[PDB]
Design a protein around this ligand. Structure first.
Ligand SMILES: [Zn+2]
Ligand SMILES: [Zn+2]
Ligand SMILES: [Zn+2]
Lengths: 231, 235
């Protein structure tokens, strides 16, 4: 009933890019591209209470992979195809979210336009892997990846951990639309309710085909295949 | 039911205490007491997205008064009598909260031990009044108010210039949670820490809670202080 995945490997860069995101996530992140495909991927460590506020993507489709479970995710059934329409009380209207208590090696797929987010509600640091695949409408970015690696590089300090400033926290939200994200700045901004009863509409979301294409790209880079680029 | 109240005046101090709380609230706060009663009161301005993460009181009973509505409050049906038992995963467990879309001049009573919080989810600053009354088990504090004013004064920077509000630091935000048990509060450090679900259907158990008698008493105290009745003290 619950979907799992054995492994999502990390593309191994000569000099790994390490970022501490303003949502308190320890990121090891890369961008890869090849014929007709572009994506960013992060292997992350999430401290007690770390995680992004609810947000919606316009340039990417996203996979979450929780090697140890424990991470609580949030997801809508409502889709928001219009980036110019924010889901706030002062207009388009806040949404309803459903929580997911992740299990070891669970794979959660979240297409563009869905509202999602996650938190570590435990007292220990937990691993998570994110894969952000460029969709068909994404503009080009320097790494051709849909824009997510450029986003985290732009608003998050390079990695004993550096310390987050108010400007960095406020920019995590204000800079987000340049990278095809509507990012709330506080938890209840885009949110009316949170429910622990998971709708079938959410539970059945799945796209193994593209993830496996991206895995082959990563493994190809790791084997030294010059026809792909990770960077 | 919607309980409402006409006015909760502010004790007018010679030297008003103005604090910018680590929860992005602009406070005008005072402590008062008389022979029979003790409390703190804040008239506050809550910017967009302002308001404290869910928390539980042990030294006070709380009233919220929303002169213009707009503020969204959260409240449990479950009480948490044991300060040493945290409502977290792996602990005594996160709780179910229910939201209240406040009406103009709505009065919300929240006894000690319930979980509550609020946020301004609008794009404009909104007013709110808090009254925090010293309950029967509260320790002695320098202001004999049950601890809330001492809490805010300890964790929040003084506002010296309304045009240049203080820049809150990481340490101050962390202290806002860490210092809280000293003042009889279990204060979460992020929204989902104490929270299992948020539901918009408000149970009639929560809706029923009220205590006009005690609010009326404190109102008199404030009004007598503002009249220079030396039988009471606000400071
Ligand atoms: Zn996302
Ligand atoms: Zn290029
Ligand atoms: Zn309170």
């Amino acid at each position: 009933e619950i979907h799992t995945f054995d492994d999502i490997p990390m593309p191994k860069l000569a000099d790994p890019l390490l970022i501490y995101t303003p949502a308190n996530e320890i990121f090891d992140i890369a961008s890869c591209s090849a014929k007709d495909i572009g994506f960013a991927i992060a292997h992350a460590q999430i401290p007690p209470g770390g995680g992004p506020m609810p947000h919606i993507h316009y340039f990417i489709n996203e996979w979450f992979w929780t090697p140890e479970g424990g991470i609580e995710l949030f997801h809508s059934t409502k889709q928001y195809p219009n980036m110019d329409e924010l889901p706030v009380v002062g207009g388009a209207g806040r949404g309803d979210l459903y929580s997911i208590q992740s299990e070891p090696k669970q794979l959660i797929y979240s297409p563009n336009h869905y509202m999602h987010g996650f938190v570590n509600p435990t007292d220990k640091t937990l691993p998570i892997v994110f894969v952000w695949m460029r969709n068909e409408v994404a503009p080009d970015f320097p790494y051709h990846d849909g824009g997510m690696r450029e986003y985290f590089q732009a608003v998050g300090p390079r990695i004993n951990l550096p310390e987050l400033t108010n400007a960095q926290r406020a920019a995590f939200a204000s800079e987000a639309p340049k990278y095809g994200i509507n990012q709330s700045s506080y938890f209840m901004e885009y949110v009316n309710t949170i429910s622990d009863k998971l709708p079938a509409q959410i539970a059945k979301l799945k796209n193994d085909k593209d993830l496996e294409r991206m895995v082959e790209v990563i493994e190809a880079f790791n084997r030294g295949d010059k026809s792909v680029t990770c960077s």
